[PDB]
Design a protein around this ligand. Structure first.
Ligand SMILES: [Mg+2]
Ligand SMILES: [Mg+2]
Ligand SMILES: [Mg+2]
Ligand SMILES: [Mg+2]
Ligand SMILES: [Mg+2]
Ligand SMILES: [Mg+2]
Ligand SMILES: [Mg+2]
Ligand SMILES: [Mg+2]
Ligand SMILES: [Mg+2]
Ligand SMILES: [Mg+2]
Ligand SMILES: [Mg+2]
Ligand SMILES: [Mg+2]
Ligand SMILES: [Mg+2]
Ligand SMILES: [Mg+2]
Ligand SMILES: [Mg+2]
Ligand SMILES: [Mg+2]
Lengths: 129, 123, 82, 80, 205, 156, 151
RNA sequence: UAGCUAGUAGGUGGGGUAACGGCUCACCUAGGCGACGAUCCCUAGCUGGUCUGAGAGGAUGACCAGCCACACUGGAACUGA
RNA sequence: CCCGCAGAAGAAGCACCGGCUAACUCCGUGCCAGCAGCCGCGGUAAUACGGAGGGUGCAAGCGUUAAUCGGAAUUACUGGGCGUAAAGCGCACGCAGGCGGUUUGUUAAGUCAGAUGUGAAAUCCCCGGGCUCAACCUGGGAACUGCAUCUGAUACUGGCAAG
């Protein structure tokens, strides 16, 4: 029973970049889109696109820089089995700020940097690198 | 070992069974030897191990290695014991102190005499 | 009753007095209510040894607090200090 | 503004009083997993006017029995 | 609480100069500076990194004369401060009153200078002080009490100071035998043989 | 202008028809003190040979790590052959706080300030098998910028 | 039974006897550890050091004339406060002290009791248990110790 | 150590208390507690802190400060803010 | 606290030197013994037992024992495992429990933000000040990660409703 769509989405990229696919796709969701959009403009992929209406699927164009995937380490932190929330000041840093931590706030979903810009805690979803 | 199992059963940790039980955290204990005896090892190893059965103030009877080079002990000789375990002795987890409480001050030792109570010889 | 007095601090032969308010039934260095300054007998002009929040004091004696004679003198000083 | 809690009765087998069970969602101290904890109570049901399961709202008051210290203030759903 | 054996044995053990004698002669003239002391002191042992660390620690101690327990205090405080710990460690080691006096050339050897401090001969900022480990502050002005301004040793040491490099951070006036600790000395202001990073590494074991 | 350091030497056996024949395995690293380092390990019949040949292989294999200022650019771990090694940059002048085996590796590479710690088994060859990999897996503040197609501050 | 303890007794008795020392009990334990324990009786007193002297001499005669071929372990001992009594004569020497004893048979009503010696005979030892002056055949006693109590 | 409890759980009335209250009593109701550990058993004064630890934690509660408890043992009260 | 006086004059020891672990030989020594935190040690030579010389460490102390944490990721929340090393129930069903696809609305519980109250003093920490230094004492601050309350925020999780 798929008791998490997000982790699946991520592994679909990890097992995607590993298998060196050109592109991967998932059953979409208004959340995953927001997840994609932020990392999309964060250079970790080229572009996403979603089609279909009754079962809209999201589809992602993976990235490779020099025979190597741009994104290389992905981990869902706040998982259904154990949630995670962080206040403003304790917003983590991924690889000394080289990585990125995607966090949802009441003001939506954005990178950790943007969060501590607005000064908003939230739920840490994934560490990307 | 998932978190939902920890909340129903926190991780335990076994206690530190004191290898020196008969001391009960006392750095030393006073005792009276209820027996004196020596033991040689098997055929290949030839040596003599000095050791006394001693009843402690707490009521325990134990085995304490005789430091050696001072042997003036016999039944009803009081003695102070400290927890030291020598290799090659199965039940000896204690060493008799040398230099106090009814233990002969060992013959003159020019080296490491404090570990035997020998006072600095005044030439 | 509720009084303003001196608790002794510092070290042997070098005493330091925190002027506090407390129920008289409490030990000289027991609990108190509102530390309101300090006293140093051995300042010798090296540093101030009399700082008082006398208005807070005034507020207290205003509502029935009584004054140890020592600090009563101390209060007189800062007023003379002006 | 008065304070108040919003629990849910689990029993009313007693004269003019009820057993409300509150539910607080708390994060575990060490293991970080959020958990739900209940705090049963003994609320004074004036007039004996609450069924079972019907979610209620209470308020803390001076002691009224060996157990009760809480007064009901309203009912927000009547036990469908 | 101070080492009182022979001096050169240390240098011969630490295999370098330590300025443990007035310096009117060269070390080799007075010892086998190139070779460790003792019977086996001739052979060159195969030491260890740990051995290196220890040997560098004992150096900076011996070159300054701080015993062990008092030393790591300097360290355990030096680490607490800001900036490069092992750096400022030497900085405060350069702050010991005697050392400053020695740097000011009032005393040929630090011990000789230390004996002065211990013998109530020096006033920092006009007031007397006799603890050798007395740290000093910038702009302080040490001096010689007149009860010793005529001591034969102080003038001879001043006549030996200029034979060595005039320190920068602190400025002296040998005319009236009193100087000024203007600036806290910098790392470069010291020597380069000292490897402060391994000195930290040692205590960080 | 290179820099070398032996790590460990073991006497390994080899049982033959009549008895055995011991040998000697050396293990060493070589670095340029400038974020470029390799390691070598070679058996031989007696120590100086092993120490010699193993020293030479390490002159090849010298990867070039993109450290900055005697310290890493981000915490990093590396796991190889049952040995786990955590490292992370440290403040200025902190020093090389590391177990024995790693310390040389960190030293010859050019690192000056780094915290570190090993885990699991502490077999020396394994941890260096487990360290250099961890080292090269560092990422410059522009390797990302490049591979992320951004400017440096665009990540920083 | 007796692992030729007879020879063990002679082999130990000779050097011990040469020491002017009296021999009292010989016990050997096989399996747990092939260790032999010897009880000696010196009127002046028994230090460990003397136990070493006899341990060396007995070890010497033991080495040449040992055909049991068990592991070579054996300790020298001097009577403890709780000291085993094997001879009728030993029972005689301790006229009026408490001695514990256990019957060889593990059948019900076995004499696992202690008493105070009232009279001593060869085959029969009188010890008082439950207010009764009982008489015990020492051969039918598995093991017995005297005054485990320390005063 | 799995059930525990009959003044037990609740109500009415009276008494009682400086004060609310099974505090007590009458009366009525038949409850109340428990696997979110009741009950039972062993151990223990509690905290600020203290030691250790990179941290999270682990340990601990000597000194000093806050709180509690006790004053040969057991029981009872009197006086009195 | 100061001044004067006399005179180097009244004042250095304890462990250890096979490895771990800084520091080595001589002579006995005979596996006799003794040494021992572990691994180990001892023969006709032992840098490991004893003495000696020399050396290392520490110092008015130095060692031994005890006790606690650490090292120990060796209860692994941070931060472990379970084919064969210890560890997947013989299998299944299933209550409690845990967890839950997707869209909208609503809620504001969780969550986040802010405010406010409180979180004794001492202690710890920063910046000072004072005892000749230091320990020590002291000013001020920081912090006390908490709790409560109020006002917001609605992405997320929960609730409700409708799909
Ligand atoms: Mg001292
Ligand atoms: Mg060495
Ligand atoms: Mg009533
Ligand atoms: Mg009434
Ligand atoms: Mg740790
Ligand atoms: Mg006390
Ligand atoms: Mg009265
Ligand atoms: Mg642990
Ligand atoms: Mg494991
Ligand atoms: Mg099975
Ligand atoms: Mg099933
Ligand atoms: Mg649910
Ligand atoms: Mg859902
Ligand atoms: Mg406080
Ligand atoms: Mg000052
Ligand atoms: Mg919802």
């Amino acid at each position: 029973s798929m008791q998490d769509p997000i982790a699946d989405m991520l592994t679909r990229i990890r097992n995607g970049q590993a298998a060196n696919k050109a592109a991967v796709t998932m059953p979409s969701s208004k959340l995953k889109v927001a997840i994609a959009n932020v990392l999309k403009e964060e250079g970790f992929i080229e572009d996403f696109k979603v089609e279909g209406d009754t079962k809209p699927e999201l589809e992602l164009t993976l990235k490779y820089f020099q025979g190597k995937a741009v994104v290389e380490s992905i981990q869902r932190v706040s998982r259904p089995g154990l949630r995670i929330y962080k206040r403003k000041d304790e917003l983590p840093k991924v690889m000394a700020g080289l990585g990125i931590a995607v966090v949802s706030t009441s003001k939506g979903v954005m990178t950790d940097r943007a969060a501590r810009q607005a000064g908003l805690g939230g739920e840490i979803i994934c560490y990307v690198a | 070992a998932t978190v939902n199992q920890l909340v129903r059963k926190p991780r335990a940790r076994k206690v530190a069974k004191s290898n020196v039980p008969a001391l009960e955290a006392c750095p030393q204990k006073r005792g009276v030897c209820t027996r004196v005896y020596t033991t040689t090892p098997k055929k290949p190893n030839s040596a003599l191990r000095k050791v006394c059965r001693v009843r402690l103030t707490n009521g325990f009877e134990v085995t304490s290695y005789i430091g050696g080079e001072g042997h003036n002990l016999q039944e009803h000789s009081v003695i102070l014991i400290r927890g030291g375990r020598v290799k090659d002795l199965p039940g000896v987890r204690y060493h008799t102190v040398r230099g106090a409480l009814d233990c002969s001050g060992v013959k003159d030792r020019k080296q490491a005499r404090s570990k035997y109570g020998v006072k600095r010889p005044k030439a | 009753m509720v009084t303003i007095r001196l608790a002794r601090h510092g070290a042997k032969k070098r005493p330091f007095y925190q002027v506090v308010v407390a129920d008289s039934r409490n030990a000289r260095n027991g609990r108190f209510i509102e530390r309101v300054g300090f006293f140093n007998p051995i300042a010798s002009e090296k540093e101030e040894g009399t700082r008082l929040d006398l208005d807070r004091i005034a507020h207290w004696v205003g509502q029935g607090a009584t004054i140890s004679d020592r600090v009563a003198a101390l209060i007189k000083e800062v007023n003379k200090a002006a | 503004k008065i304070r108040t809690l919003q629990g849910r009765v689990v029993s009313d087998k007693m004269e003019k009083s009820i057993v409300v069970a509150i539910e607080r969602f708390v994060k575990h101290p060490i293991y970080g997993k959020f958990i739900k904890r209940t705090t049963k109570l003994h609320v004074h049901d004036e007039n004996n006017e609450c069924g079972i399961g019907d979610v209620v709202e209470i308020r803390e008051c001076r002691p009224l029995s060996k157990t009760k210290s809480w007064t009901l203030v309203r009912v927000v759903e009547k036990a469908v | 609480a101070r080492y009182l054996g022979p001096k050169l044995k240390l240098s011969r053990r630490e295999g370098t100069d330590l300025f443990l004698k007035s310096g009117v002669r060269a070390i080799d003239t007075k010892c086998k500076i190139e070779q460790a002391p003792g019977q086996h002191g001739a052979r060159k042992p195969r030491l260890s990194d740990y051995g290196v660390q220890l040997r560098e620690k004992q150096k900076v101690r011996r070159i300054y004369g701080v015993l062990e327990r008092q030393f790591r205090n300097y360290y355990k405080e030096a680490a607490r401060l800001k900036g490069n710990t092992g750096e400022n460690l030497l900085a405060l080691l350069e702050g010991r009153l005697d050392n400053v006096v020695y740097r000011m050339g009032f005393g040929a050897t630090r011990a000789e200078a230390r004996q002065l401090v211990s013998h109530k001969a020096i006033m920092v900022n006009g007031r007397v002080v006799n603890i050798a480990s007395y740290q000093v502050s910038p702009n302080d002005v040490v001096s010689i009490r007149e009860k010793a301004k005529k001591q034969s040793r102080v003038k001879a040491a001043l006549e030996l100071a200029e034979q060595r490099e005039k320190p920068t951070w602190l400025e002296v006036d040998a005319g009236k035998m009193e100087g000024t600790f203007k600036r806290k000395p910098e790392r470069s202001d010291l020597s380069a043989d000292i490897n402060e990073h391994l000195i930290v590494e040692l205590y960080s074991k | 202008e290179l820099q070398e350091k032996l790590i460990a030497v073991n006497r390994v056996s080899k049982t033959v028809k009549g008895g055995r024949i011991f040998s000697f395995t050396a293990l060493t690293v070589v670095g340029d003190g400038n974020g470029r380092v390799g390691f070598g390990y070679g058996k031989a019949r007696e120590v100086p040979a092993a120490i010699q040949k193993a020293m030479e292989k390490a002159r090849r294999n010298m990867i070039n790590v993109a450290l900055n200022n005697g310290t890493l650019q981000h915490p990093v771990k590396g796991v190889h052959t049952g040995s786990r090694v955590f490292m992370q940059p440290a403040s200025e002048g902190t020093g090389i706080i590391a177990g024995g085996a790693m310390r040389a590796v960190l030293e010859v590479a050019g690192v000056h300030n780094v915290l570190a710690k090993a885990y699991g088994s502490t077999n020396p060859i394994n941890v260096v098998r487990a360290t250099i990999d961890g080292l090269e897996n560092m990422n410059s503040p522009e390797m990302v910028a490049a591979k992320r197609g951004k400017s440096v501050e665009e990540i920083l | 039974m007796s692992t030729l303890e007879q020879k063990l007794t002679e082999m130990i008795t000779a050097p011990v006897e040469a020491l002017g020392f009296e021999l009292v009990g010989i016990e050997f334990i096989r399996g747990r550890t092939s260790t032999l324990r010897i009880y000696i009786d010196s009127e002046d007193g028994i230090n460990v050091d003397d136990c070493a002297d006899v341990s060396h001499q007995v070890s010497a005669v033991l080495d040449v004339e040992d055909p049991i071929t068990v592991a070579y372990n054996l300790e020298v001992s001097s009577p403890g406060l709780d000291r085993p009594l094997f001879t009728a004569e030993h029972y005689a020497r301790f006229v009026g002290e408490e001695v514990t004893l256990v019957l060889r048979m593990a059948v019900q009503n076995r004499r696992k009791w202690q008493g105070v010696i009232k009279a001593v005979d060869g085959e029969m030892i009188t010890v008082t248990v439950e207010g009764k002056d009982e008489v015990f055949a020492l051969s039918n006693i598995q093991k017995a110790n005297l005054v485990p109590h320390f005063a």
